[PDB]
Amino acid sequence: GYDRALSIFSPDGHIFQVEYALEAVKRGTCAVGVKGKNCVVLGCERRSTLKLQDTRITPSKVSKIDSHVVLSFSGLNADSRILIEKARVEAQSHRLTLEDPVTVEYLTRYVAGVQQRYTQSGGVRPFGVSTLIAGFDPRDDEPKLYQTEPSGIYSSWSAQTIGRNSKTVREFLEKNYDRKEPPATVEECVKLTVRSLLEVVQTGAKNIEITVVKPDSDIVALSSEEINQYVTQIEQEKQE
Amino acid sequence: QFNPYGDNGGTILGIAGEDFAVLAGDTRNITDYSINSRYEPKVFDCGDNIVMSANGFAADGDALVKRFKNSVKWYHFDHNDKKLSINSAARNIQHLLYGKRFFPYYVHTIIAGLDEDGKGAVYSFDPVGSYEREQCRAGGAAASLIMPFLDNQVNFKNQYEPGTNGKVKKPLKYLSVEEVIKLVRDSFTSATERHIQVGDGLEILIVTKDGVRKEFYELKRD
Amino acid sequence: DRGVSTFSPEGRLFQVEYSLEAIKLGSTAIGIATKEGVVLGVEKRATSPLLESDSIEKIVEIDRHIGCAMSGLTADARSMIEHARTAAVTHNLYYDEDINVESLTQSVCDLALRFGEGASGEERLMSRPFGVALLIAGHDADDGYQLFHAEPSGTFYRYNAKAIGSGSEGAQAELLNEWHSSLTLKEAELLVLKILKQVMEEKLDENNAQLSCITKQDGFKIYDNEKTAELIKELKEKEAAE
Amino acid sequence: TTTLAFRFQGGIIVAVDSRATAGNWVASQTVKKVIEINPFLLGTMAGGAADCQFWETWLGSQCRLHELREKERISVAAASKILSNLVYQYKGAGLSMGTMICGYTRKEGPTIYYVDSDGTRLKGDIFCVGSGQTFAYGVLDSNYKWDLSVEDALYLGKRSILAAAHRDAYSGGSVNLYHVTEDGWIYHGNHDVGELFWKVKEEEGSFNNVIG
Amino acid sequence: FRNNYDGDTVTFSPTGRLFQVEYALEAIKQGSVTVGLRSNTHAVLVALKRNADELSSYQKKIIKCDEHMGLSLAGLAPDARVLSNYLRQQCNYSSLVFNRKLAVERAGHLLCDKAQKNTQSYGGRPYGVGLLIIGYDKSGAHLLEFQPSGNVTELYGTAIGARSQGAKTYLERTLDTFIKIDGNPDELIKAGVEAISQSLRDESLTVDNLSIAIVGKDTPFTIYDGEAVAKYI
Amino acid sequence: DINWQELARSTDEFNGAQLKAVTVEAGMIALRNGQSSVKHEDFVEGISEVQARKSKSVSFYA
Numbered sequence A: 001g002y003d004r005a006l007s008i009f010s011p012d013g014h015i016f017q018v019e020y021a022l023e024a025v026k027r028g029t030c031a032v033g034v035k036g037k038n039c040v041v042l043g044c045e046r047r048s049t050l051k052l053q054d055t056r057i058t059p060s061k062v063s064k065i066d067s068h069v070v071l072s073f074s075g076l077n078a079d080s081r082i083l084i085e086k087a088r089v090e091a092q093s094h095r096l097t098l099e100d101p102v103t104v105e106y107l108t109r110y111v112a113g114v115q116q117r118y119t120q121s122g123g124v125r126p127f128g129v130s131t132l133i134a135g136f137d138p139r140d141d142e143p144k145l146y147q148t149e150p151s152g153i154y155s156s157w158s159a160q161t162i163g164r165n166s167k168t169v170r171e172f173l174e175k176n177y178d179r180k181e182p183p184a185t186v187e188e189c190v191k192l193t194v195r196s197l198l199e200v201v202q203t204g205a206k207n208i209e210i211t212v213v214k215p216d217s218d219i220v221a222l223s224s225e226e227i228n229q230y231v232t233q234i235e236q237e238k239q240e
Numbered sequence B: 001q002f003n004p005y006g007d008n009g010g011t012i013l014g015i016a017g018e019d020f021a022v023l024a025g026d027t028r029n030i031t032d033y034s035i036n037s038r039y040e041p042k043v044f045d046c047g048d049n050i051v052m053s054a055n056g057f058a059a060d061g062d063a064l065v066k067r068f069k070n071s072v073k074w075y076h077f078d079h080n081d082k083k084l085s086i087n088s089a090a091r092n093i094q095h096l097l098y099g100k101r102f103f104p105y106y107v108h109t110i111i112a113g114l115d116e117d118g119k120g121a122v123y124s125f126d127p128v129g130s131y132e133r134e135q136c137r138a139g140g141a142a143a144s145l146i147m148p149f150l151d152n153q154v155n156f157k158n159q160y161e162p163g164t165n166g167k168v169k170k171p172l173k174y175l176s177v178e179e180v181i182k183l184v185r186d187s188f189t190s191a192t193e194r195h196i197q198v199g200d201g202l203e204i205l206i207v208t209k210d211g212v213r214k215e216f217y218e219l220k221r222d
Numbered sequence C: 001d002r003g004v005s006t007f008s009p010e011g012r013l014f015q016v017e018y019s020l021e022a023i024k025l026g027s028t029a030i031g032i033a034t035k036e037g038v039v040l041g042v043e044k045r046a047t048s049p050l051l052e053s054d055s056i057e058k059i060v061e062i063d064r065h066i067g068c069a070m071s072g073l074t075a076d077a078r079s080m081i082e083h084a085r086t087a088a089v090t091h092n093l094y095y096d097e098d099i100n101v102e103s104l105t106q107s108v109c110d111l112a113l114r115f116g117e118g119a120s121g122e123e124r125l126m127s128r129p130f131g132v133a134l135l136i137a138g139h140d141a142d143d144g145y146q147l148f149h150a151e152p153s154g155t156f157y158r159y160n161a162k163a164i165g166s167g168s169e170g171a172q173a174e175l176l177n178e179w180h181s182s183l184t185l186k187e188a189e190l191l192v193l194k195i196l197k198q199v200m201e202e203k204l205d206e207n208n209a210q211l212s213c214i215t216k217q218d219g220f221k222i223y224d225n226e227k228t229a230e231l232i233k234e235l236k237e238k239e240a241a242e
Numbered sequence D: 001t002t003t004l005a006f007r008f009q010g011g012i013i014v015a016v017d018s019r020a021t022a023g024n025w026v027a028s029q030t031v032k033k034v035i036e037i038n039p040f041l042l043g044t045m046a047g048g049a050a051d052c053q054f055w056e057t058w059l060g061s062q063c064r065l066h067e068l069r070e071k072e073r074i075s076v077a078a079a080s081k082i083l084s085n086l087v088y089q090y091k092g093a094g095l096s097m098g099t100m101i102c103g104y105t106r107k108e109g110p111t112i113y114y115v116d117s118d119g120t121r122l123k124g125d126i127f128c129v130g131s132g133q134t135f136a137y138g139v140l141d142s143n144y145k146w147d148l149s150v151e152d153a154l155y156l157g158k159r160s161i162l163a164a165a166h167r168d169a170y171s172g173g174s175v176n177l178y179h180v181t182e183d184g185w186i187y188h189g190n191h192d193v194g195e196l197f198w199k200v201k202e203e204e205g206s207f208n209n210v211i212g
Numbered sequence E: 001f002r003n004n005y006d007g008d009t010v011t012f013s014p015t016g017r018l019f020q021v022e023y024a025l026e027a028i029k030q031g032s033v034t035v036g037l038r039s040n041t042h043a044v045l046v047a048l049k050r051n052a053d054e055l056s057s058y059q060k061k062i063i064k065c066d067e068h069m070g071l072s073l074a075g076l077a078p079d080a081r082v083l084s085n086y087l088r089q090q091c092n093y094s095s096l097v098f099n100r101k102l103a104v105e106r107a108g109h110l111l112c113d114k115a116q117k118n119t120q121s122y123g124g125r126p127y128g129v130g131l132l133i134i135g136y137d138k139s140g141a142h143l144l145e146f147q148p149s150g151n152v153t154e155l156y157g158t159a160i161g162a163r164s165q166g167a168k169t170y171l172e173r174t175l176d177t178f179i180k181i182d183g184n185p186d187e188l189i190k191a192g193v194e195a196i197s198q199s200l201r202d203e204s205l206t207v208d209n210l211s212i213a214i215v216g217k218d219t220p221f222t223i224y225d226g227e228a229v230a231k232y233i
Numbered sequence F: 001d002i003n004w005q006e007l008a009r010s011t012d013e014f015n016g017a018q019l020k021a022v023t024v025e026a027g028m029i030a031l032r033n034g035q036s037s038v039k040h041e042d043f044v045e046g047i048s049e050v051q052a053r054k055s056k057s058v059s060f061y062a
Helices: A016-027 A077-098 A104-120 A166-176 A186-201 A224-239 B058-078 B086-098 B143-150 B177-194 C014-025 C076-095 C101-112 C168-178 C185-199 C225-241 D049-070 D076-090 D133-142 D150-167 D193-204 E019-030 E077-097 E104-120 E165-173 E175-180 E185-199 F004-010 F016-033 F040-050
Strands: A031-035 A040-045 A070-075 A129-136 A143-148 A159-162 A208-214 A218-221 B011-016 B021-026 B029-031 B034-037 B050-056 B107-114 B120-125 B131-134 B136-140 B201-208 B211-218 C029-034 C037-043 C059-063 C066-072 C132-140 C144-150 C157-159 C161-164 C209-215 C219-222 D002-008 D011-016 D020-022 D025-028 D034-038 D041-044 D098-104 D110-116 D121-123 D126-130 D175-181 D184-191 E034-038 E042-048 E062-066 E069-075 E129-137 E140-146 E152-154 E157-160 E210-216 E222-224
Touching: A016 A070, A016 A129, A031 A070, A031 A129, A031 A143, A031 A186, A040 A070, A040 A129, A040 A143, A040 A186, A070 A077, A070 A208, A077 A104, A077 A129, A077 D076, A104 A129, A104 A143, A104 C076, A104 D049, A129 A159, A129 A208, A143 A159, A159 A166, A166 A186, A186 A208, A186 A224, A208 A224, B011 B050, B011 B107, B011 B120, B011 B143, B011 B177, B021 B050, B021 B107, B021 B120, B021 B177, B050 B058, B050 B136, B050 B201, B058 B086, B058 B107, B058 C101, B058 E077, B086 B107, B086 B120, B086 B131, B086 C076, B086 D049, B107 B136, B107 B201, B120 B136, B136 B143, B143 B177, B177 B201, C014 C066, C014 C132, C029 C066, C029 C132, C029 C144, C029 C185, C037 C066, C037 C132, C037 C144, C037 C185, C059 C076, C059 C219, C059 D049, C066 C076, C066 C209, C076 C101, C076 C132, C076 D049, C101 C132, C101 C144, C132 C161, C132 C209, C144 C161, C161 C168, C168 C185, C185 C209, C185 C225, C209 C225, D002 D098, D002 D110, D002 D133, D002 D150, D011 D041, D011 D098, D011 D110, D011 D150, D034 D049, D041 D049, D049 D076, D049 D098, D076 D098, D076 D110, D076 D121, D098 D126, D098 D175, D110 D126, D126 D133, D133 D150, D150 D175, D150 D193, D184 D193, E019 E069, E019 E129, E034 E069, E034 E129, E034 E140, E034 E165, E034 E175, E034 E185, E042 E069, E042 E129, E042 E140, E042 E185, E062 E077, E062 E210, E069 E077, E069 E210, E077 E104, E077 E129, E104 E129, E104 E140, E104 E152, E129 E157, E129 E210, E140 E157, E140 E210, E157 E165, E165 E175, E165 E185, E165 F040, E175 E185, E185 E210, F004 F040, F016 F040
Parallel strands: none
Antiparallel strands: A031 A040, A031 A159, A040 A208, A070 A129, A129 A143, A208 A218, B011 B021, B011 B136, B021 B201, B029 B034, B050 B107, B107 B120, B120 B131, B201 B211, C029 C037, C029 C161, C037 C209, C059 C066, C066 C132, C132 C144, C144 C157, C209 C219, D002 D011, D002 D126, D011 D175, D020 D025, D034 D041, D041 D098, D098 D110, D110 D121, D175 D184, E034 E042, E034 E157, E042 E210, E062 E069, E069 E129, E129 E140, E140 E152, E210 E222
16 A cells, blocks of 8 residues: 555555554563662563573673663564664763763654654665663663654653553553552562563563663662562462 | 965944944055055945945955845845844854855954944954954054044043043043044044055945935045 | 655645645644733643653743644654754854744745655755644744744744644634634633633643743743643633633 | 953852953953853853854854753753864864853852863863963962852952953953852953052052052 | 556657646646736736635735745745745846846746756656746846746736636736836736736735735835735725 | 637547536526626636536645
8 A cells, every 4th residue: 555655645644664563563572661769670571482592692682772771672673673773872972972971861862763764764664663761860860761662752651561462561550550659669669560571471480581770870680589589479469 | 376365455444323333434445555446435335224344355355245245135035024133244244254264264344333222333353253342443454543543532541530630530422423424534534644545535334224324525645 | 656746636736635634633732822922732632640741742842932832743743843943043043133933934844845855956855745733833023922833735824823633623613703812811821721621522630731831021931730720720610600 | 361260169250351452452352251152151262262252152052952952951061072072173274262161050060161272171170261371370379269258259350350461461351250150150240450450459558569 | 647658757648748737737727816917117916815714814925036026826835935946046146146137038948947857857846836927127027927837928918826717808908008008106006906806706805915016117026015005906 | 708718728628528518517606696697707617527626626725
């Protein structure tokens, strides 16, 4: 149909290539962000069911853009490699010219700008990745959560999920989290993200990856034994 | 090696009163001690009661005006005939001179007019680029010859009230239009004698809200 | 193709027809101009309570004396917004004069009044056909408060009141007669809320609607969610009496 | 030219002359050497007048665009660096700029970045740029403390120019006093240096090198 | 014949008539009506200012191009714009370089050409908009019609856009009267009002809608509205 | 008031039957109007129903 054109504006008002991007986000891993008062917890699936895989050199889904800016993603791994690279360069650009450390909010916009640009320029596909960019603003200790979409726009939610079986996760996020009050403690906040991920992973120590990002360049990924500890405690409740 | 920039002499004078502004100048056009042209005007109307002379190297000034005329046409077309401001013109002119900064233009430019308040107002440009609002400013090589007179006949700078001997400064007094034209004539007449740039004619275009008046007086040829 | 090289049999251009639909499906935005300020209201179309509503905004300060709300395609609108900001800033640098609203409407529309890939005595920077309208409101000295309806289609139209988006046919019908020039700024705010209340299926509160004004005095001034909320309370009250 | 700036607890005092000489003669005594880049920043015309004017008119645009985009006040750091980059890259264009960008944020506190035509960007507590800098420094340094009172800083700013003005040939004009407060710069009048000389002469018994 | 031949400018029907050209003409028929006429000493254009609704201001379709030039549009709005700015450009070049005002005729030959370039080209737009251009040069008053084809024709009087029938007839009749009338701005301007009433289905006669322009050997290009056109209405 | 020439110039490739369709339409407007008279104006509009396009199709500029 109109899938062969981008320039052609379409009376449907909807260019099919754009629709098809969404199909692509769905297929990918589930990646979730839930934020406290002092933390972003990012719980994400990393598949590891692959036989004869040396896990050490296989890239973790989470990639440090900046020293305090992180990215998780759902959608095609190849296409996603371009966003990570543009975004890294721009990170260091920011410091080189403003001196100021990376404004996260600029960065959210910069990234979306690329998925937008390519919607207008024929002969350049719109990317079929949606991302989570999360960070902490210069001179600030309030957590910051953003999602980008392949529609070439951006938005902030109090907590959000993307990728396979996101429908299932969204019910959890409505009932156990609230915009009004995020779980004040870091600890509360991490335990709920583990329970959400369990709904679609259905038991895995390394299939669940938790990276907690705190203010002031504090990045630490939870220990496999500690992750295992969240699971067992939760699993006792399930039969009660 | 070709001469990079000429000089064509001349003296101009922009004075900001409180209800009129004049832009005066001689008609004498020179290179060395030869008179190139005895009669050749230099004050030009740019419209909307803004007068302009870009005095010094005549060729650089012809260019500058020539482009500005075109800009007046496109300012009105896009802005639904908004009256081209005095300040707007000024910013425009700065930007033409800064255009080549590497080999800067060699013109000492003065635009006079009314500000929007409605007082006479003069803005003056040094060739380097910069511009600022001014009270009274002569231009050219005899700028320095003329200015002390005005700072002792109207500005009353370094004048004090008779008998105080300095306690109480003699305060500014607003002058009629006429009074200023005489003052402009006498300054220029004195300079005909004391400088070879000024002579032939004193052509003054006066800009008011009431329209444009033209004033002419002959100066000697010796 | 059905580009712009193809002239419609109609006497139109196919892309131009295609642009209109995107405005029709767009967000509902209302503007009513007085000679005491212009008041613009929008639905921020809140969809979930986990969505942060405050963060999101469809009324954006473009310049000191001008703001815009957007109706059409969300994608196109990025580019459109960046164009407008730039267009204003260039003139301020260049002549250091406050511009008219009129002057701004034209300049935004300058990129708009060309479509295609072909150019013949001009540059191209476009690669499509854009389909996003704005309400461009402001103040100039000359003609006071002005409201324009900037179109991605034919020449810009000045309006004294305009409503666009999906709530448009009702909203506009109400406006023809409810508009007047004798309204106060206080009368006019409540009248914008009134129309908004009717055409939005879900009940009116300050978490899904936001009000803003351009009055020269306070510049482009975004209403406090407290300031918005009270007037909603006032709205319900007068309707009970009525 | 003499222009100076000092940071203290109360913010920053910026004081400038008004003289501008072309050739050996006084061209003007009304060139205001305060450029209001915007309500938050003061830039000085010191150095090359035209270059400074032109490029801070430019700087106004960059500040404005930033403020629009992120909707918060620009750091003094961000704006001065933006200027610094532009001027290095174009150098060898008859550029001669020398400016102090003066601003008072809580992001950083009172902050002064001296920008230079070479492209140098130097932070300091106290900067003094000018032909007459050299005179100014003597009086300025000895009454300069961070914990100097606000009231005393106002006097200090007038006195520092009075001194330079007197000895330097290329300085006279008038005093413009400005205080860069938290909320932005505030203008504290024009005061003619010519007149101030006599008051001060009488008041302290200073100006005794001077006849009588 | 949708697509195939005659579907793009390059491809010929066997006969060699582009179907698209007729469509570009149709755009003018859909367009705002305007009546133009002249005498030796003046050229007078009358155009109805279209509007969407009451609150939308009656929108000018007569555009001043230059002090001594102006045009009116009937047809596609984006095209008229790219062309109009070009008109302005050329006139400025001549005044600067060669002294002279750009002659009206000689500007038209260029305008023709610009339209033909897009007809040669793969892609692009043949301009789909027709323009009545009036002007005062050293040959005095002129009136041209610019066609979407490109062709420029010196005509005593012509009208384009909606219901042209009533005003064309009217012009044929009064042809001899307005061409003899010279030295009378006011009477030419009257003839022109009377003419546009015939075309209209009496949609409006309001001062508010009719906008009259005049350029000649006497008046510069001046736009007349409200009271000034209430004399003749 | 009918100008046979003006109608004929805008029409291209209308055979005899097509042409009578135009004629009947101009008169049909006039029947509603009540005037026995058919105007030249009725006819120019009346072509465009016999065309593929509906008569006087709405357009964004005018």
